């Protein structure tokens, strides 16, 4: 059986992971959910524990630890190891009974748990694209040291790319390693984008779009931060950098393409110019499942793709004048060093300012551009601990700079 | 260095094979063309010999054998082994200096050379779909005896399918082996079709179509027989049976889909319902190249696919009323036994009758249907030589039966 831990089990990735695990386990007993980890949703964790009966339970907030203990007594024939905080997370990571960890936690705590999963030579199913963009150097360093640790991408486009690769080649290397693209014969990547809600608007129309316009009737309903990033196409920008780090593909060989039907999830061009693509309805269960079954596939009861019904698939180039966040992402990535950290941090501030109606659409890219122009390359620490501190300092600096730019003009 | 023999080196498959070998070798010396075999095109073979300098030359037609020997004296520093006929073909297949054999011959000499390549445990790049459809049983039996022989598909759709599979799984099985689909986690196949030159005709327009209409202003350049098969969609009918035999996919799990843009070459749905597809411009060099590089890929200088420029990809279900040959192919495949042999043989006659303006469009399917109805299933011979003779007998019977049906109605 596949022994899986779910970190952030009540979030979007965590619940979709448990859903597909549930459905697949009805067809064949494939997964043992060995651990669940949440911040403070003690009741939701209890309900999950009642169904999945994991060996480990962990709650980050120590204040609800005793409440969890008492709730779990209601479940019969069940004596779990109940843990608290960072120390509990670390103990789960060190368990030789856990094979794979799904990290569905946002921000630093996602990176922190990823770090410990890697340090224990686990397979890490990673959805947090901001952690790859911001701390890619650090992750690459850790993966070079901990040879059996692997990051498997869960972001749908990156899963699609990963699914397009020959595992006879993938098994000779791993993601976030030098020469990954050479070993896999990768020439170029088509990174498919929905294009977001503003995809046909004029420059003058874009001047006055609000966050309500971005958040109005989503094609796929998702969190506010990513929805704003989808509207500016900074989501794709971040994903370009993620692609570069995960697959060691040069920026000149990554093309963003707008595919509004969201059936083709991305494509890989190999060195012979043959192109392989992965296709399905827009359903996050496939990328999550593949991250847990790789290098194998298992049966699901998901609806089969009806291509004749789908009927038409369309592709066009995004306009970088209309979606300048894409250009800024490429520029930051190509500059290298900690520019991607700066891009991510300044976008965090600009995204949130636009979300709360404090700035306009082109102010997002304006602020990010100014923060990038103010950053000076730093010597990259050789010490792993100093490197992590360096990333956090630069992240903090960039957020402050974005905020100061906003404060000067307001 | 990949040591290759090309059988039928002046036909379409052969010349495209030599073109891509030439272009790839300019990038990196990967291929040695060890042998070239033609029927009677002695001057063309000489010109190829002058460039590629193969160890072996073979010409089927004894009457130009001496002319070939005299022509080859003009080539500097070159002492090839110059051979004739079936015996020359057999000697090439048995050479320890040949790894891979491209079968670019139609008719029987195709099946005949395929057999000898398999008997010598070679990798056989097989383009002749009629051979698989007609003698699939025999090929399976032979591959079970000669366990190191492998058939690698060159037919573009079947290459596409093969390219969509994980070689970590493919390497544990082989084409035309029982359980190929199970080992590769294949659930279903989308077999993509151009739709042919008659795809948009009304029923009334179809009743009056001639071979001239099929052969005029082609979308892509190809032979008369296959062009007629594309027009009736019997080409796709044959390819359904080819798919079943190559990949051990059930007929209920093979779907023919009309994709008029000819960019997606076919798709594989896996047991999780994830779909993988292979895409390129319609250029036969990719499938030929992959058959020779599998399980690896090599660099080419082919034009990269510009998806944005392609812009739109479309899919629809073919009409079985307009294209009854598709239905007849499924029926023959599902009934099994030697019905595919009968389908292929009767089609050979009906195709040629329509080509030469002797019968009308719907007479093609009428004749094939009548021959299929006439056939009586036979006990499948256990001995492989007895089985080959049985296939040949049934093939001859079915051609004669089709011909007699024509002669009665004429
Ligand atoms: C899903 N995903 O990984 C995203 O980044 C969101 C993306 C796609 C939204 C639509 C969608 C949702 C889910 C999926 C799924 F389920 F296949 F992952 C595909 C497509 C927005 P954009 O491409 O404009 O940057
Ligand atoms: C190419 N091929 O394998 C055919 O069977 C001919 C096919 C496709 C003709 C156009 C074409 C030519 C070459 C290629 C290539 F490059 F993929 F080989 C794809 C498509 C006709 P239909 O699908 O209607 O039965
Ligand atoms: Mn994504
Ligand atoms: Mn074909």
From Swiss-Prot, chains A, B:
Residues annotated as binding NADP(+): 10-13, 39-41, 130, 223
Transmembrane annotation, as ranges: none
Coiled coil ranges: none
Tagged with keyword Transmembrane helix: no
Activity regulation information from UniProt: Inhibited by fosmidomycin and its derivatives.
Pathway(s) annotated for this protein in UniProt: Isoprenoid biosynthesis; isopentenyl diphosphate biosynthesis via DXP pathway; isopentenyl diphosphate from 1-deoxy-D-xylulose 5-phosphate: step 1/6
Binding positions for 1-deoxy-D-xylulose 5-phosphate per the UniProt entry: 129, 156-157, 194, 217, 230, 235-236, 239
Co-factor binding comment: Binds 1 divalent cation per subunit. Mg(2+) or Mn(2+).
GO CC terms of this entry: apicoplast
Gene Ontology molecular-function annotations: 1-deoxy-D-xylulose-5-phosphate reductoisomerase activity; manganese ion binding; NADPH binding
Required co-factors: Mg(2+); Mn(2+)
The reaction(s) this protein catalyses: 2-C-methyl-D-erythritol 4-phosphate + NADP(+) = 1-deoxy-D-xylulose 5-phosphate + NADPH + H(+)
GO biological process: isopentenyl diphosphate biosynthetic process, methylerythritol 4-phosphate pathway involved in terpenoid biosynthetic process
EC number: 1.1.1.267
Chief localisation class: plastid
Intracellular or extracellular location(s): Plastid, Apicoplast
Enzyme superclass (EC): oxidoreductase
Binding site residues for Mn(2+): 155, 157, 239
Keywords assigned: Apicoplast, Isoprene biosynthesis, Magnesium, Manganese, Metal-binding, NADP, Oxidoreductase, Plastid, Transit peptide
Role, per record: Catalyzes the NADPH-dependent rearrangement and reduction of 1-deoxy-D-xylulose-5-phosphate (DXP) to 2-C-methyl-D-erythritol 4-phosphate (MEP).
Subunit field text: Homodimer.
Family, per entry: Belongs to the DXR family.
Record-given protein name: 1-deoxy-D-xylulose 5-phosphate reductoisomerase, apicoplastic
Species: Plasmodium falciparum (isolate 3D7)
